[PDB]
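Reminder to self: tokens first, then the designed residues, so the page reads top to bottom the way the pipeline ran.
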């Protein structure tokens, strides 16, 4: 499913991601935009043999099991396929484990390089939240 900007914002807010660990809703929407382009079905292979899955591009080396990643940890105890559902619940709950202390949202390369330190408030502009 390809979410709309406000559509995803409302869903993330409903799941308690707004200000989660101090990260405003705009940070999470911005991360989703640049990681998956708001597409829950996005998958991207990595040089280390791992693969990123879903709207928040969660990695198969540490967080979910995809059955083909050497040294997989599956810290979120879910198959990576669960992160591709139109329902973002699994992605949100895993993202909450990832951002909790560690290095927080620095775990997301797109967030660090395109959201961190930027005007993230703009990502929820016009949204009825
Ligand atoms: C969104 C996403 O999946 N991003 C992936 C990153 O999470 C991943 O980074 C590595 O993550 C692991 C697990 O959190 C890091 O290990 C943790 O490191 C902290 C210190 O910062 C330590 O306190 C934790 O105990 C330790 N956890 C465990 C279980 O050992 C690890 O340092 C990260 N590695 C790097 C280079 O950042 C990266 C790389 O696998 O992939 C992203 O896709």
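Designed residues (129 positions):
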């Amino acid at each position: 499913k390809v979410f709309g900007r406000c559509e995803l914002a409302a869903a993330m807010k409903r799941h308690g991601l707004d200000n989660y660990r101090g990260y405003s809703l705009g940070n999470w929407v911005c991360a989703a935009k640049f990681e998956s382009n708001f597409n829950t079905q996005a998958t991207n292979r990595n040089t280390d043999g791992s693969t990123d899955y879903g709207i928040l591009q969660i990695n198969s080396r540490w967080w979910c099991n995809d059955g083909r990643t050497p040294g997989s940890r599956n810290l979120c105890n879910i198959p990576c396929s669960a992160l591709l559902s139109s329902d973002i619940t699994a992605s949100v709950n895993c993202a909450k484990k990832i951002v909790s202390x560690g290095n927080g949202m620095n775990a997301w390369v797109a967030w660090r390089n395109r959201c961190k330190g930027t005007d993230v408030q703009a990502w929820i502009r016009g949204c009825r939240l």
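The first strand starts at residue 43 and ends at 45.
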